Structure formats: structure tokens, C-alpha cells
Design a protein around this ligand. Structure first.
Ligand SMILES: [Mg+2]
Ligand SMILES: [Mg+2]
Ligand SMILES: [Mg+2]
Ligand SMILES: [Mg+2]
Ligand SMILES: [Mg+2]
Ligand SMILES: [Mg+2]
Ligand SMILES: [Mg+2]
Ligand SMILES: [Mg+2]
Ligand SMILES: [Mg+2]
Ligand SMILES: [Mg+2]
Ligand SMILES: [Mg+2]
Ligand SMILES: [Mg+2]
Ligand SMILES: [Mg+2]
Ligand SMILES: [Mg+2]
Ligand SMILES: [Mg+2]
Ligand SMILES: [Mg+2]
Ligand SMILES: [Mg+2]
Ligand SMILES: [Mg+2]
Ligand SMILES: [Mg+2]
Ligand SMILES: [Mg+2]
Ligand SMILES: [Mg+2]
Ligand SMILES: [Mg+2]
Ligand SMILES: [Mg+2]
Ligand SMILES: [Mg+2]
Ligand SMILES: [Mg+2]
Ligand SMILES: [Mg+2]
Ligand SMILES: [Mg+2]
Ligand SMILES: [Mg+2]
Ligand SMILES: [Mg+2]
Ligand SMILES: [Mg+2]
Ligand SMILES: [Mg+2]
Ligand SMILES: [Mg+2]
Ligand SMILES: [Mg+2]
Ligand SMILES: [Mg+2]
Ligand SMILES: [Mg+2]
Ligand SMILES: [Mg+2]
Ligand SMILES: [Mg+2]
Ligand SMILES: [Mg+2]
Ligand SMILES: [Mg+2]
Ligand SMILES: [Mg+2]
Ligand SMILES: [Mg+2]
Ligand SMILES: [Mg+2]
Ligand SMILES: [Mg+2]
Ligand SMILES: [Mg+2]
Ligand SMILES: [Mg+2]
Ligand SMILES: [Mg+2]
Ligand SMILES: [Mg+2]
Ligand SMILES: [Mg+2]
Ligand SMILES: [Mg+2]
Ligand SMILES: [Mg+2]
Ligand SMILES: [Mg+2]
Ligand SMILES: [Mg+2]
Ligand SMILES: [Mg+2]
Ligand SMILES: [Mg+2]
Ligand SMILES: [Mg+2]
Ligand SMILES: [Mg+2]
Ligand SMILES: [Mg+2]
Ligand SMILES: [Mg+2]
Ligand SMILES: [Mg+2]
Ligand SMILES: [Mg+2]
Ligand SMILES: [Mg+2]
Ligand SMILES: [Mg+2]
Ligand SMILES: [Mg+2]
Ligand SMILES: [Mg+2]
Ligand SMILES: [Mg+2]
Lengths: 44, 92, 273
RNA sequence: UACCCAUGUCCAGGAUGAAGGUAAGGUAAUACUUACUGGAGGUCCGAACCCACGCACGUUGAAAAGUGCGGGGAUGAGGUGU
RNA sequence: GUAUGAGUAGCGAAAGAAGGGUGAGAAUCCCUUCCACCGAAUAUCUAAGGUUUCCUGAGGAAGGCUCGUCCGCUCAGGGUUAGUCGGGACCUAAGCCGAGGCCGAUAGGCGUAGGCGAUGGACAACAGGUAGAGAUUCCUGUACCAGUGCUAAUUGUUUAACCGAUGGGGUGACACAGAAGGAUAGGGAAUCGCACGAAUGGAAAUGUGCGUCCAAGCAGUGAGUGUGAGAAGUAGGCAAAUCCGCUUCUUGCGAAGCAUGAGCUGUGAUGGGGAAGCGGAAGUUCCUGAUUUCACGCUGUCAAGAAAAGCCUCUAGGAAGAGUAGUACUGCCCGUACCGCAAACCGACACAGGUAGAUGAGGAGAGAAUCCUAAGGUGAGCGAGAGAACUCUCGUUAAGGAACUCGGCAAAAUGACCCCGUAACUUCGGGAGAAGGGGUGCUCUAUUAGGGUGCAAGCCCGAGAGAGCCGCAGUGAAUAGGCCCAGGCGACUGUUUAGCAAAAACACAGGUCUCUGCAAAACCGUAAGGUGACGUAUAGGGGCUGACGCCUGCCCGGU
């Protein structure tokens, strides 16, 4: 039938975007730990 | 920017040169230049009278050269048409 | 009266409804309307705190005058019309100033009457006075508890109270539930009974007519699981295998009194219901 | 996916004929009877749409739940987009 | 890393054939003819999503379930043009953030002013052309919206032209169902124009084929739909108001006047498009007719059907400049390529699955059903040849007709329109399409009896009867209820274990018990803050029973 992933440009940025991570204390911890690994892309 | 900073270089192709006789000139402009700045930049450099400007944005093409993937520069292309009672620009 | 439907369909077999013979107009006053949005029993935090709510016809709020502060200015009953937000009907009043306000329609109120409020008002159905100057034995409604707040105690359709006596600073009132209560003598009240007394006799008749009013289905606790309700579990049908029937949160539900035992307002209640 | 909120949108055709109204009759006046009108309903038959009752086949599948022939609802406690 | 199974299973719904061409090499690439498939789609647009997959020139290592000279693959160059389209510089809903502020071991939670936020509101452009790739964007023609400067006249200067709110008021502004109309799109016949005029018995005309037009804007008109007029006075609209609201008098009515209003006519048109043989003739009359528009307009019902901006108006205020006409100039940012029921989106795949919306023709037909076709699009990325067992999907069967089997499971049978006729029981509505029967084709009466349309010409709709004619068979194909008797359960419509159980289970309208006097009880949270409820005992929460009919007995020692 229909599958679990239904793409949407707006829905992706509003949940996983950079400004969403920067608005919470625990979202800034995700960016801090992703910078520690030196990951190419932070957030979505 | 300056007049020489807004405008970078002309575009010389089959489509670009097929409209030179129509008094339409194709340029590559700065990515952050508005349609009005391009109008006054042309009149400062070539001293022609400008009638219209049409702009469009181009993305970068994904290119490969062996195990390496990247993109070319994104472009901003402007087409300038001049009034009939004005001089011409010699791409030559 | 009460309209009755022929048994044309199984869902129309037992329905009864009002005929709205007392409703004068079908358009509300545009300047006294406010939007309402359904909460569906959802909390400040988006949680479902009250069950069996949500999903009916959409409505709009009518600004209704409960304080009735406009003293000395006559007001004519212009229309009697329908309010979806309450059981009783409402009436539009054109005051002599040119300004319009909504009140609850009392029993025996019809278009063309004149309604007063204040100390000099007469004891007629629809007028509003302070309790200090209303004769003993009259039937009133829209009683308020704090002076200047607005009508609060008797407000449903067909309900009414009665004045029993005076105790100086206070006035005895027998509320609609049969409770005798002391009310401050400076508070206000409106004369008469609320006028839609046929509202009790409506037979809904359909499962889906309850859904138009915003009432989602209710599930008995005996057909749940042991982790859902104290009554859940058991092979086959099971009785209430406990000392007393209990609410979904513990706290026995049959006969158990839940009024606070050290409540301040307990000295103003002469006798309980 | 479950429930809810705000704002949009979809449901080919056909059938039946509730309340009410009008005319003739009928009465002291009403009940009531007959014709025409009217267009109600979690009404009926049935496509799109939603669903999943039977069987067969697939079962290192076309498919980590499907297809084929029949089947239920189809103006509502309806389906569906953002 | 490499074997065995093994050159074995598979190669993913479907109709292809031949003749030319290219090439080292052709079932598979290109062209031509014939044939076949879809056609309320397998056709045309357009959102989301994907990001160059679009075009041209080269290429055949790998990918393509075979082949390849080919490709959505590789390489190199190109391609997306907006004052008017969609979004921002305009507005707000749900929701989110939130100066001060209220709570809280920290972290933080909540929340006022204020602000973001479309899936909605407001808002000025149409018709053609474009042979590699863009078109309300480029070009041609004709427009509109806002603003600016300049020329010529007009007017006014503080008893003050004119402007006018970030404030008041009106509008914007709204549900569902039903019916009857006006118009138009679409469709169909004659007329007219052009071409042919014929292969095999016949036809030079009651012959055949194709076509039988056109915007926005501007001027006029217009089916209709709403439709009380004037005067006087102001306890109200945070101040004021000549505006709104309220009161009182004169005057009354399918008659006008005011708002809207689909459409029609002239101009736009000395323009554009147009079948044939590069130029281009003709464009009339009638019938039918919407699921589109007038228009939530009218009627009815109860479950009682967003906000703000915008527009108009009123003053508060600002005021020496202001309108008018003509001309010329000015108008920003983002998207625009291509696929888009699909080989380019979500499913690991070039995957028999899923994917919102607008249009969606003809014959027969009530119909978007069914069969065959139009415009348009396709022949499905392995083949040919033999016609064994066995498996799957179909078609017929002599005599019998459930004897099969756990069980008539599966299959077979009924099926459309018109007429006759129809039981027990009943909550009087039903049961009921009960059951059971009869008639359907073609020709002549006959451009019917009669209707719709029109001034007439004419054009559509078509029941009864008679006479006949032909088959085994006349809704001659596809599509279209099998029925009856009796009992258990559940009153009914509805819901349920995505992926083993659709039910006698849940729900339901109704009944009863019990709590709750409002800072209500109950519930979430440490609290603040909330739902309950912008409600008030005819209201709200909890337990049990489950339409309707007749009823619901005894025990208070134990808990
Ligand atoms: Mg979310
Ligand atoms: Mg990421
Ligand atoms: Mg652009
Ligand atoms: Mg409840
Ligand atoms: Mg229940
Ligand atoms: Mg259970
Ligand atoms: Mg327990
Ligand atoms: Mg138990
Ligand atoms: Mg048991
Ligand atoms: Mg409880
Ligand atoms: Mg209904
Ligand atoms: Mg139904
Ligand atoms: Mg769907
Ligand atoms: Mg289900
Ligand atoms: Mg079906
Ligand atoms: Mg099926
Ligand atoms: Mg059925
Ligand atoms: Mg073997
Ligand atoms: Mg073998
Ligand atoms: Mg294949
Ligand atoms: Mg996109
Ligand atoms: Mg290509
Ligand atoms: Mg290959
Ligand atoms: Mg070669
Ligand atoms: Mg090639
Ligand atoms: Mg390529
Ligand atoms: Mg233009
Ligand atoms: Mg816009
Ligand atoms: Mg703060
Ligand atoms: Mg907050
Ligand atoms: Mg706000
Ligand atoms: Mg915004
Ligand atoms: Mg929008
Ligand atoms: Mg516009
Ligand atoms: Mg194209
Ligand atoms: Mg409104
Ligand atoms: Mg026509
Ligand atoms: Mg005033
Ligand atoms: Mg015109
Ligand atoms: Mg209405
Ligand atoms: Mg395009
Ligand atoms: Mg393939
Ligand atoms: Mg596919
Ligand atoms: Mg449609
Ligand atoms: Mg058709
Ligand atoms: Mg037809
Ligand atoms: Mg149709
Ligand atoms: Mg066919
Ligand atoms: Mg046989
Ligand atoms: Mg036989
Ligand atoms: Mg038998
Ligand atoms: Mg046997
Ligand atoms: Mg047997
Ligand atoms: Mg069977
Ligand atoms: Mg029967
Ligand atoms: Mg015979
Ligand atoms: Mg049942
Ligand atoms: Mg299951
Ligand atoms: Mg099942
Ligand atoms: Mg509290
Ligand atoms: Mg509250
Ligand atoms: Mg039970
Ligand atoms: Mg008992
Ligand atoms: Mg005891
Ligand atoms: Mg005792």
C-alpha cells in the first residue's frame, strides 16, 4: 500500500532544521556532539 | 558594487549571438545585483540608452572528474535591450 | 410544543424534537457575535483531560448581559431567538439609547414588552433588582453571588429559585436543587422562571444526533483490560469483583461524597439538598 | 498509525414518497375522507470513491500482506488534501 | 576468496508483419504500409515530490534480466526572460514565539502587550507567432493598474481649496438539502466552399471526403435578483461626529429610482487563424443542451453555520497649495528547464502496489454503467517451434440431479423496460422488486393521435391499435436480484484485532444509582496555568444495563 516516508520540504526543516535545534537546550547539545565527530552536515 | 563589479563578462553562444541584430545583449552579472542596478551599470560603461533588462538564475551542475563530485558556480544572466535611437555594443 | 416523528425509518422511530414556535427571527445581531473554537476536552498542554468531547457542529458565541447594570433606561424586547451555546433562548433588547444587548429569555416574555432594572423597577417578569428589595416568596432566576459580578446561580432552561426570608445582611434563597442558601442582600436577581421548560422532554433517537452536539462514545469499564480500569479483566462477563464500584482512577464512585470537608462557604448553607 | 484542531474539497444516474399546503366533500365548529402539490430520511438500487466476507492462485512471490472472480457502504456516526 | 546444486529456476500481466536505410555486426535502431490495444483513459493540464533526468554533437568499457549502431547510461557544449501568473514587500485561523510578569533545587514551565504563521480573504492582460531546447515571461497587435516630471487652462490661501485616521460605523461575512428558470460551453443536422466523381454487379448525383472562425479592453444593452422614502429629536457607539443605532410624524407600494447581474451587439478585425492545391475559398439556419455561470439567488430545516485586511463613510486632526486635460517616463525580490496514475514521486529494482485537483467526445443508453470508436496516445526490453504427462486460467458435455461433502465450498441458475398480481405477521411505516405470471424483432397504415420549438419555413419528441414477414431463439452481443419455510443471538445504521478471528464482541438512542451551589465536582501539572465552560442542577463527572412491550420477588447478619 502506502509507505512510512512521505517527503515534504517544509516538514523536514521545521522538525530537523538548524533553527529548530538552536531553539532548545538539548537541541544545541545535538549540534555540539555532531561537531565533535566532525560530521560534514549538521541538522537538515 | 561599482559598475564594473556588477557586470562580469558577456555570454557568447549560438543563442546569445542570434539576437545581437535584435539589439539584445547577454551578460553575466553579480549574483546579488538587482534588475535596476544592471540598467545603470550598462549606461555608465557603454553610454547606451537601455530599454529593458530581463534576469534569470541558474543552478550549478553536478560534475564528476573521477571519484570526486562537486558543483559548478551558480550564474545570474541578464539580457539587455536598448532603444532604437541609441548606439550599439560591439561584442566583436 | 414537542414535535413527534412518524416511524418512517428505524433511526427516526423514537425521535422527538421542539417545534421552535417561540422563536421570532433566525438571524443573530452581527455586532454581538464572537468566534468559538472547539477544545475537545484538550488541556493547556494538549492532553485529553475530560473524556467524551469533540467534533460537533461549529457555533459562534453570543455576548449575553448577565450583570444588567443599565438602570433607569427602558428596554423593549425586540426578538426571541436561538442560542446554540445554552439550553435557554435569548432575547434582544433595544434600549432607549439606541444600543442592543442580549439577555436570557424568561418564561412569559414576548415581543413588544418593556423591561426595567434598578431600585425603582416594578416586580414584573423580566425586571432586575437587588435582593434587598424583592418581596419574600417571589420566584427569581439569574442570581449572582458577588455584587457587581453578574448573574450566575439559576440559568438553565426551566429552572427557578425562591426567596424564603431575610437575615439582615443576608437573604435566604431556596436554589433549584432544593438547597437553602444565604446570599448577600446587595446581589441582584431577575424575576421569573427561565422559559424553555420543554427542553427536558427531547428524545435524541439517533446515535448520530449525539455526535452533532459534540459527544463521543463512552466505553464501560467492564469491557477493558486490567491495566486500563479497575473493573477490567476476567474470562467471559464478570461482575464487579470489588468492595465498591470505582472510577477509572480509583476513588469509589457510588455514594462516596467528594465535597471538601473544610470548605469556607460551609457556614452560608442552611440545609443541604 | 490512533484521537483531536483550523481551513479547503468529492460523492454518474435512478426509485420511494414524511411533515406541511390547496380544492371538493363533512360538521354548529372541529375530527375525518378523497385528489393535486410538497420533497423528509444515520431511506432503497447502483458507478467513481472507501472497505475487506468467500474461493482460487501466489508462498527462494510481480508484491516483507498482493492479484483474479464474486462481496459490503456509497448524503453520512461519510471519504479525502494542506 | 572460491566451489556444489547447474548451464538448472527465472528473464516481472499485453499482437505483431513485411519492405527499404544505417552499420564491422540488426527480431531489438530509423523510415513506410498494413494490423492490433486504451479512449471518465493507457488522452490534455496542473500541485507535491525529485533536482538537470530537458536539447544538440560524439560513444558503446560498465548499467539495460537477451541484443543494441539505441537509451532516463558515458563525455563535451548548451537551455529556464514577468508592473498584470503563484509567493514576498498586504491580511488573518489552528498553532508557535513571547519585553515586562507569575511560578519553580538548577535547568526551566506558563503567559500580557507585540509578532510570526495558508490549507482561506484582497489584488491591474488578452489573442496570435515562434522547425534544437522558454512563453498570460520573448516578438506583433490592442489594453489596464499605481506613480512621476513637463506644457495649457481652472481654483483657493488661514473666518480658511483640499486631505483624512493606527479611532467610531457599514460592508467584507460565510451551514446543509431541494426545485424551478435565464444564459452559455459542448454536441448534431441542413446550407455554403473546396476536392474527387471511382477498382468488382450499380450510381454524374437524394454520390463520397474535409472544412463550415476569433479574444481582453472600450461604448451600449440586458434575463433576473435585493429593494422603503423623507423630515424632526438624541441618557448609546472610551473624546467628537452631519456617520451608525433608537424614537416620533408626512407619505406608500410587482409602479419607478437605487445596488448588483450571467449574457448579447458594435469596435477591437485593412488584424489573425483556416481544407486543399507557398498562397489560401466558405463561415449561414435550425435542433438539442449542461456536472459551468446568474447563485447559497429562492424555498425549507435544525445540528444554528471563521478572523483580519481591503472598500465606503464620520469626525478628531493637517492645511497653501490643489485637482483637470494632454504628453513622455518609472514599476523590486523568489519560481519558471523536464517527469508528474509514472522507467524521473513513496516502495532496496526500468517493481502487476500507493499518489490531491481541473477538463474528460460520438452511437445505442437513465447514466461518468456496458460494447465499439473520435482527438490523442501505445504494441509493454528475451525470442521460435513442438502441440507429451502434470499444474493454472477458460469452453462444452450423453442418462441421473447433492447420491459429493464437516458443510450445496466452488460452479450452475435469476438479472433490463412495460403490464397483471401478491400471504402469515406488524411498532400500521412495513413485509414487497414477497411469491407467481404475460409482452419485447422488422415492414406498411405513418413527415400518427398528440406534444416541444419558430412569425412562418422547417426541426426534434413517439404511446396505443390494426394488418402482415422472418428465425431454434427478437432486452437475439456486453452489462443488470435466485426464491421460500422455521429456530438461536444481537433491536436497528455504525466500530473492531495494519499482517490468522467482522462475530453472539464494542458503540448506540433509552433506563437507573450516585457525586457536584460554582475558585462546582472530576482530570493534567511541583506550582503557576488550564480543560470542565466563555457552561450553572432541564447543567457537568462516574458505575451498571442496552430499542420497544409486560415486569424486575425475598435477605441489611458479613463487607
Ligand atoms: Mg509535527
Ligand atoms: Mg541530517
Ligand atoms: Mg523572473
Ligand atoms: Mg461522560
Ligand atoms: Mg456505554
Ligand atoms: Mg476484552
Ligand atoms: Mg488495577
Ligand atoms: Mg473484575
Ligand atoms: Mg464466567
Ligand atoms: Mg474518579
Ligand atoms: Mg440525516
Ligand atoms: Mg443510505
Ligand atoms: Mg484515493
Ligand atoms: Mg479497518
Ligand atoms: Mg461495488
Ligand atoms: Mg474486488
Ligand atoms: Mg445489497
Ligand atoms: Mg535438477
Ligand atoms: Mg526441468
Ligand atoms: Mg517483459
Ligand atoms: Mg518543485
Ligand atoms: Mg533525451
Ligand atoms: Mg547487455
Ligand atoms: Mg559505428
Ligand atoms: Mg546515441
Ligand atoms: Mg545524458
Ligand atoms: Mg508586456
Ligand atoms: Mg500574489
Ligand atoms: Mg523574560
Ligand atoms: Mg510561552
Ligand atoms: Mg494576539
Ligand atoms: Mg505573514
Ligand atoms: Mg493560498
Ligand atoms: Mg490579479
Ligand atoms: Mg517543452
Ligand atoms: Mg457572520
Ligand atoms: Mg451552440
Ligand atoms: Mg453623541
Ligand atoms: Mg466584445
Ligand atoms: Mg439562506
Ligand atoms: Mg513547462
Ligand atoms: Mg521493462
Ligand atoms: Mg510502477
Ligand atoms: Mg469534474
Ligand atoms: Mg462515453
Ligand atoms: Mg444518446
Ligand atoms: Mg457525461
Ligand atoms: Mg477497443
Ligand atoms: Mg451432463
Ligand atoms: Mg441433458
Ligand atoms: Mg434436495
Ligand atoms: Mg458419504
Ligand atoms: Mg449426504
Ligand atoms: Mg456459494
Ligand atoms: Mg418474504
Ligand atoms: Mg418458425
Ligand atoms: Mg448488530
Ligand atoms: Mg487481521
Ligand atoms: Mg478476515
Ligand atoms: Mg488551579
Ligand atoms: Mg476556563
Ligand atoms: Mg451488556
Ligand atoms: Mg433484584
Ligand atoms: Mg450493612
Ligand atoms: Mg446494620
Amino acid at each position: 500500500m502506502k509507505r512510512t516516508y512521505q517527503p515534504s520540504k517544509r516538514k523536514r526543516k521545521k522538525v530537523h532544521g538548524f533553527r529548530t535545534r538552536m531553539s532548545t537546550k538539548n537541541g544545541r547539545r545535538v549540534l555540539a556532539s555532531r561537531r565533535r565527530k566532525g560530521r560534514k552536515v549538521l541538522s537538515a | 558594487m561599482d559598475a564594473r563589479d556588477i557586470i562580469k563578462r558577456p555570454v557568447v553562444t549560438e543563442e546569445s549571438t542570434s539576437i545581437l541584430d535584435d539589439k539584445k545583449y547577454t551578460f553575466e552579472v553579480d549574483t546579488r545585483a538587482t534588475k535596476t542596478q544592471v540598467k545603470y551599470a550598462i549606461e555608465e560603461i557603454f553610454d547606451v540608452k537601455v530599454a529593458k533588462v530581463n534576469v534569470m538564475n541558474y543552478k550549478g551542475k553536478l560534475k564528476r572528474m573521477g571519484r570526486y563530485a562537486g558543483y559548478t558556480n551558480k550564474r545570474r544572466k541578464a539580457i539587455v535591450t536598448v532603444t532604437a535611437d541609441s548606439k550599439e555594443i560591439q561584442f566583436f | 410544543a414537542i414535535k413527534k416523528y412518524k416511524p418512517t425509518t428505524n433511526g427516526r422511530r423514537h425521535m422527538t424534537s421542539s417545534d421552535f414556535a417561540e422563536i421570532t427571527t433566525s438571524t443573530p445581531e452581527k455586532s454581538l457575535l464572537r468566534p468559538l473554537k472547539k477544545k475537545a476536552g484538550r488541556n493547556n498542554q494538549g492532553k485529553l483531560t475530560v473524556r467524551h468531547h469533540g467534533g460537533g457542529h461549529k457555533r459562534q458565541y453570543r455576548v449575553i448581559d448577565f450583570k444588567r447594570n443599565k438602570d433607569g433606561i427602558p428596554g423593549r424586547v425586540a426578538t426571541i431567538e436561538y442560542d446554540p451555546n445554552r439550553s435557554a433562548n435569548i432575547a434582544l433588547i433595544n434600549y432607549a439609547d439606541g444600543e442592543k444587548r442580549y439577555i436570557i429569555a424568561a418564561k412569559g416574555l414576548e415581543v413588544g414588552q418593556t423591561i426595567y432594572s434598578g431600585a425603582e423597577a416594578d416586580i414584573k417578569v423580566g425586571n432586575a433588582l437587588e435582593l434587598k428589595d424583592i418581596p419574600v416568596g417571589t420566584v427569581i432566576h439569574n442570581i449572582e453571588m458577588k455584587p457587581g459580578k453578574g448573574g450566575q446561580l439559576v440559568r438553565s432552561a426551566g429552572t427557578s429559585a425562591q426567596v424564603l426570608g431575610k437575615e439582615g445582611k443576608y437573604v435566604l434563597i431556596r436554589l433549584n436543587s432544593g438547597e437553602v442558601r444565604m446570599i448577600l442582600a446587595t446581589c441582584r436577581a431577575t424575576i421569573g422562571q427561565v422559559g424553555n421548560e420543554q427542553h427536558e422532554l427531547i428524545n435524541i433517537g439517533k446515535a448520530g444526533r449525539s455526535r452533532w452536539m459534540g459527544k463521543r462514545p463512552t466505553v464501560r469499564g467492564s469491557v477493558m483490560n486490567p491495566n486500563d480500569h479497575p473493573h477490567g479483566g476476567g474470562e467471559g462477563k464478570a461482575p464487579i469483583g470489588r468492595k465498591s464500584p470505582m472510577s477509572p482512577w480509583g476513588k469509589p464512585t457510588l455514594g462516596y461524597k467528594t465535597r471538601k470537608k473544610n470548605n469556607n462557604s460551609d457556614k452560608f448553607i442552611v440545609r443541604r439538598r
